[PDB]
Every structure is written in C-alpha cells, then in structure tokens.
Amino acid sequence: ADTIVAVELDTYPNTDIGDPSYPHIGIDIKSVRSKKTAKWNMQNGKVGTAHIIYNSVGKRLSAVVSYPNGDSATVSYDVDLDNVLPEWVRVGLSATTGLYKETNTILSWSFTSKLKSNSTHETNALHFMFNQFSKDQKDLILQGDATTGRDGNLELTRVSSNGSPQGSSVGRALFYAPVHIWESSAVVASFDATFTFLIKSSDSHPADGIAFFISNIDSSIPSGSTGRLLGLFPDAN
Amino acid sequence: ADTIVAVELDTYPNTDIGDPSYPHIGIDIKSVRSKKTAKWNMQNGKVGTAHIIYNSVGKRLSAVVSYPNGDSATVSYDVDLDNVLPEWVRVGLSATTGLYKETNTILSWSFTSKLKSNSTHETNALHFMFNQFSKDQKDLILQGDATTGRDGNLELTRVSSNGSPQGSSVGRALFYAPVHIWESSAVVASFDATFTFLIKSSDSHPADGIAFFISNIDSSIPSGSTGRLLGLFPDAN
Amino acid sequence: ADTIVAVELDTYPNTDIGDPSYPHIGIDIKSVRSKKTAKWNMQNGKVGTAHIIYNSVGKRLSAVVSYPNGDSATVSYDVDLDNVLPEWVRVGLSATTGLYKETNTILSWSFTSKLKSNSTHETNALHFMFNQFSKDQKDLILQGDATTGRDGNLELTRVSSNGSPQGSSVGRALFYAPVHIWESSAVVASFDATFTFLIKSSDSHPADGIAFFISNIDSSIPSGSTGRLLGLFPDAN
Amino acid sequence: ADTIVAVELDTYPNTDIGDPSYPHIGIDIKSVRSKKTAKWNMQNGKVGTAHIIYNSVGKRLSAVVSYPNGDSATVSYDVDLDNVLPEWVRVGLSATTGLYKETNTILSWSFTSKLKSNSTHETNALHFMFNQFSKDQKDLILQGDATTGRDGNLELTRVSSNGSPQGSSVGRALFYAPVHIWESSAVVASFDATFTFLIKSSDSHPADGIAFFISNIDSSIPSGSTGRLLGLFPDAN
Ligand SMILES: [Ca+2]
Ligand SMILES: [Ca+2]
Ligand SMILES: [Ca+2]
Ligand SMILES: [Ca+2]
Ligand SMILES: [Mn+2]
Ligand SMILES: [Mn+2]
Ligand SMILES: [Mn+2]
Ligand SMILES: [Mn+2]
C-alpha cells in the first residue's frame, strides 16, 4: 500500500465518502476522507492557480486556490509529517474523471524543498519549474492517461483530438527525482509547490478533480482509483 | 511611534516585563511582552542559527533556533499580519546589552519575501544573502553601535579592540531596500529569514539579546531602548 | 562624471555618433559609442524581452533581445569589468525620446547578482523581481519623467493621459539598494538581468531607445542627455 | 558511443595524450584531448572549489578552481553547445586513479540550469544542492567505485577503511533527473555548477583527476576508462 499525502481540488461532492455538499479544497492524509476541507467555487473554463506551503516548525500544511478575479479559498491543517511520510518521497500531480468529466490541464508547475540539518545548515535543496511541457518531457514520469506537449501543456486525463474530455479517466505526473522530505536529524524541513490549471466541462457536473501529492518513491496508480478516488487511494477508508 | 514585529532571542529574563524565568525565544507584536515564548538553552560562545518562517495562508509565524549539537527550540504564533504591519516595511537585526553584557555577532544573514497577487502571479520577490560583511557594506543601514567588517562579521553592539563586550550598548542593521510585505490584493504573501550568530560573555548573566524585526520603513532606534528593550520598543507596555 | 556601463536598445540610428544604419543592440562602456553592436529588427507595438548576462570567469558581457515570433538579436563583448566599474554600483533602466518619439514601457524587470569570495564561498547575493509596478513603488528610485503604476507598468518616459508619447523626454528607474558588483578578493562575480518592454510609435521613426545600465551609486541623469544620449552620458565622446 | 562534454581537473600530466607538462584545468569536448587548458597548482590535502558557467548568448564555457589561500586558475572556450550535446542530458561528477592515486572526495555539489523559450519566458529551470551525502542518497545515480555517506561526503573512487586511496579506480555520480539543456526554440539556455573537493595523496604524483561532465541521458562508464581517461572516454582520440 502506497503512503499518500495530498491536497485535493475536488470538483465533485461525493457525500458518500465524506465529501462536502459542494466543490472544495481539502487536505488528505492517508485517506480519501479529507482531514479538513473548505468551500471552493470552481470556475468552469477559467485558469486557476494553486499554492501549497508547509514547514516543519509551524508543522502546518496550508493551501490556497485563486482566480484572477480575486476569488480564492484556503485551507490549513496542523500536522507533523515526520510522523506520516517516509524520509524519501516523490511529488506529483494527479487527476481523474468519473461518470462525469472535465479536462484536467496543467499549464505550469514549480516546486521547492529544503532540509537544514543538525549540522547547522549544510542545507540540501531542490527546485524545479515547468512553464511549458514538450511532447517528450524526460524529467517527468507519466502514469495513466497523462500526456505532455499538447499546446505546451500537461493533460493529466484523456482528451480526444477535438478537445473533448473523456470519462472514467485517470492520470498522474511525478517529478523524476526523489525528494528528501525529512530527516530525524533535520532542524527544519520546508517546502512549497505551485501549479496553474484549467478545468473545463461541456456537460453537467464536472468531476472528479485534481490533486497535488507526495508519496513513497515507488508509488503507482492504485487499481480502480479513477473517478472519486482521484488516482490516489485504493479505497474510501 | 514605530510599528514593530519581531522574533527575540532573549538571553536575559526580565520577569518585571513578563519575561520567563529563563532565556527564551519569543514572538513580539508591537510589544516587548512576547505574545508567545519557549524555553531556550543558550550556549555561551557557541555559534547558533535562527530561522524564521511565515505565510499568509496558514497565517502562522514560526521560529527555530538550533546549535550543531542538536539542541533546538521552536515557537509559533497564529497571527494575521495584514492587520498589524504597514503594506511596506523594512527588515533588520537588532541587539543590545544591559547592566550585563555579551557580544552580539552576526556571521551571516539571508532573507526571502514573495507576493503573489490577485492578478494570478505576476509575482514580486526579494532575496538577499550576506555570508560576509565588509568594512563598508553599502546595502546595510547601520544604526547605533553596529559595525561591519570585523573578522568579516557584523557586530551589532559595541566591542572593544581586544574583543571585550561593552555594557549599555544597542545597535541595529537594516536592509537598504524597503520590502513590500503585503497587499490587500495579494493572494499569498510569504517570507523566511535566516541568520547565524555568536553570543559570548566573560562575566555572569549575559544580556540582553538579539532580535530579527520588521518595522515601518522609516523606523529608527527608540530612545532608551538599550538593555531589556532590545533596541526595538520605547517602553514595556 | 558618472561611470556608466550599459546595454542599449537603440531604436534610432544617429550615424553622427557612430550608430549603425539601422536600429540595433549595443554594448556601451563609458561611451555612447557602442564597443559592439548588432542589427535589431524592432517590432513597433509588440512586447519584447531582453536578457543580459555576465560572469567574471569568461569576462564576457552578453545580451539578447527576442520577440514571441522567434526574431532575436544577440551581442557579446569581451571585457573585464573589474577594470571599469567601481566596486559598488547601482543598476537601472533608462529611456529617452528625442525629435522623434515612442512609449518606453517596462512590463517587468528582474535581476540577480552573486559574489563568491577568496574565502571560498560565504557567498553574497541579491535578487529582485518586479512583474507589476504600483503607483508608489518604494524600492525604485525614479528619475526624470519615469512613472509607475499606469496599467501596473513602469513608464520610463512621458506619456499623456490618452497614451500618446511625448518628445524630448528622459527617464530612469534604479533599484533602491546598492549592489556589490566586484571585489578584488572575489573569485567569481556574476550577474544577469531580464526585462520585458513595449515600444510604440504613432509617427515616423521612433527614437531614441531604452538601456539597462550599471553606474556609480550616486549617479543621476546627466544634463541634456535626452534623445540620442539615452539619459546616460553627458556627451558623445 | 556516449557524447561527453566535461571540465577536467587533471592532476596528472599524460603528455602522450596532449596533456600539458603540469596539472591543469581543461575543457574537453567529445575528446580526452582538451580544447583548452590552463596551468593549475594543485594543493595536496587542501579543500578546493570549482565553479562552471555557460550561457547560450555568449556561447562561452568558463571554469575556475580556487583555494582559500587565494590561488585560482581559470579557463574559457568559445563553443556553441547547441551543436554538440543532445537536447536532453544528464550531469555528473567523475573521478579516477591510475598507476598513481589520490582520494577523490566531493564535499558538496550544486547545479542550476534554465531555458527561456521562443514563447518569451514560460521558463523551465532546475536547481539542486548537496552539502552532505548520506549513505543512501536516492537522488544520485552512483557508478563504479563511487560511494556516499562516509563522513557525509561523496567518495568518487575507492578508499579503504583506514582512508588510504586505491589505485586503478574509477567512479561517477550523476543527478537522478535528466536535464533539458537546449531547445531549438529556446532563446536562452544557461547553466552553472559548483562543487567542493578534497584531493589527497600519500605517495608521489597523484592521479588522475576529477571532472564535472554532461552526457547523453543513458551514459555509463566506458570500459577501461580508469586512470588518465577519467571515466569519461573510451579512448584518447
Ligand atoms: Ca471526489
Ligand atoms: Ca530582555
Ligand atoms: Ca540613438
Ligand atoms: Ca590525466
Ligand atoms: Mn473530497
Ligand atoms: Mn522577552
Ligand atoms: Mn548606439
Ligand atoms: Mn588533460
């Protein structure tokens, strides 16, 4: 079983799994049932931006999603990740469609992570930035229906030639290099991630959403994790 | 009256002002009376490192001080700085000595601040790093007894030719450029700061401490702010 | 007399001062007479981007200007800046108009500079980024006709209410903090700068151009340095 | 056959392969026979620092090696890498010993690479920094005799339990993620790399040296490339 920590933009309220009554941001720790959520007003066909922040001092995971018109939603959860994740992890983006559907299109993604040790600095750090994705992007590991290069963007879930989103689709993109997320001997571990995205739906009720996630290095898409499970978890426990 | 927000390494417990019974880290908002403190075991003559982190999402100010031997102390306080500081500020370091004394020596200082707007990025950012200070460091504004260039370090308070710390001393160093700390239209404002320091005392009970601070751009040392007031505040209110 | 090193985007050929027979990029060292130039096809009304790069190892100053359509021009010149500039400098943008005119609009500007010493690192560095300029941008020093905040941009030369460029105009913007550009004891000093710009003209030939420059810290606009002198030099020597 | 571009710190002059009559820095393009070299006074047992810089504008590859005592050597070579390397590459460190020997210890290594496209920015970038290496450093690919974790350092070539260097040894470390080094449509591609190293020898002349290199993504150590071939090239052509 993979170990997953994620921030979800959940466009589809499955109330059966503890989802709220409306599209939402949520913080998911080893469960599809968010530890915390906040109401999110999703704008169809508009380009949004998500920022994720964490530091080992405050031990608080925070996320915000905003649109150029000023609408934004934030969620924060107090958690000590030293106690959750493995020392080494990979980070990525995941997206799905269900019975209902949407394009899950990533326009850009950047990430920064830092470890300052008991050695008093001698800091290790990683930063990457993608503002365009080519057809062969060798520094990304693509899983599922994810493709790169279409209009210089990353399409996480299946889209036809004419731009129409497909249902029952799942895809993920992980950064090629492993990340050293924490160390018992680290005095501070902190990271932030940013991505811009475009969700569009022709039909009623888009679903199911997009998530930024951190997993064990060897993580792969759990079976039947399409739709409401967001390509992250094998079940709703 | 200046507006001050600071993180204090308070080596001297003035219990009269609400200081704890022991040297401590503290978070000070417009008052010398910390909103929150944590016990700190100060190691005389050892080089320490302080990290300060804040983000507008979690709205939590965090600080940690550590030594190479693994000892560290952390403190966090939930605060919305949009409601405290002016839109534009300056950042700096301050240090003092009282009746008792210590060297306040800064070995290195770095800082990073970012504003992502309602414009959806078009981000503004500032970063600077000093790992050595020359005799004339033009990008620093020195106030009080602060000097640069001695052994490539920044000495915040008065030290004689032979290295002996002087009492009743106060000094500050501010970065030359103003910083845009928040904007009503900003979706995220975040910053972090790091500095390494060396506190040494020949006599009993070093005092009074060192602080990292953010103030209105025109801030200058309040009169009689030496000793326990840390060159920050005009009084103990 | 100021000491000026600049990269010019010269939209107007003043053959009398050694300018080429067409708009051009040029490298100017202590003279309006470029040490090296390259032909530049300026696109009226289009948004361009300039990048400038230098390092103390190769001791080569390089610049490129490009447009989204793929047109670009580059120029490089071998030079040891240790022998030209003062140890401490300021960096800025300058623009002018003359008998002929153009808007000199800066959309964004970023800069990074680093000094790695004989101390083996203990590196000092500065980075800033502006992707929007507000009406009161405290970390910029504005000289001449330069204004900030109009459509979130920086307008270096005078523009009327209705958007019409004015003739015989000059303006500069300098970053507020001084920059430590070289040190006798530095093993490497390197910097890069980037800005995006929009030049528009209603009338016949636009003039006179925009430059990125580095000067002594107290540099101010030389008298009569409008038009072909680009606000940088007091004469054409 | 791999495609290799490297900067060599050649501690052993093999005059038979065009090496100079003294230890030297060199720039090697697809050949062990440096295109350019500079005399290098290697200090046995001292910690050195190497910096490497390149940009697509100046199209000049530069390198400097320095020690804390102020001794340094630099070498530069004009080259258009667009015409040499594949679009995607990996970067790494290599070292060898031969008949003669030395420790090839890396203390720290950082790297930054950036591509600004014809799209006008939408920049892609990668940065990493190692200031300590643990026993299991998952973001490094180790080849040959290379090991990590001994005193928090990276030992590229074989060293016994007691610290004694072994002869006829070769080892390399490559960053785990591929790097997009150029693109036909990029307006600027630039990178820099820095590492600190410790070379020690008990016996008479140390050999054979350490190199920073860029290769095709699937590059592996060519057979018999120990000693003077530095683990990079299959022959001396
Ligand atoms: Ca769902
Ligand atoms: Ca006190
Ligand atoms: Ca001109
Ligand atoms: Ca050799
Ligand atoms: Mn949910
Ligand atoms: Mn206190
Ligand atoms: Mn000219
Ligand atoms: Mn050689």
Numbering used by the authors:
A (entry chain B), B (entry chain B), C (entry chain A), D (entry chain A): 1 to 237
Manuscript excerpt for this entry:
Lectins purified from seeds of the Diocleinae subtribe exhibit a high degree of sequence identity notwithstanding that they show very distinct biological activities. In the present study, we used mass spectrometry to determine the amino acid sequence of a lectin from Canavalia boliviana seeds and solved its crystal structure in complex with Xman and the dimannosides Man(α1-3)Man(α1-O)Me and Man(α1-4)Man(α1-O)Me. Furthermore, we characterized the anti-inflammatory properties of Cbol, adding more data to the repertoire of wide biological activities displayed by this group of lectins, despite their highly identical sequence.
Other than in the carbohydrate-binding region, the complexes do not present any significant structural differences when compared to the unbound protein.
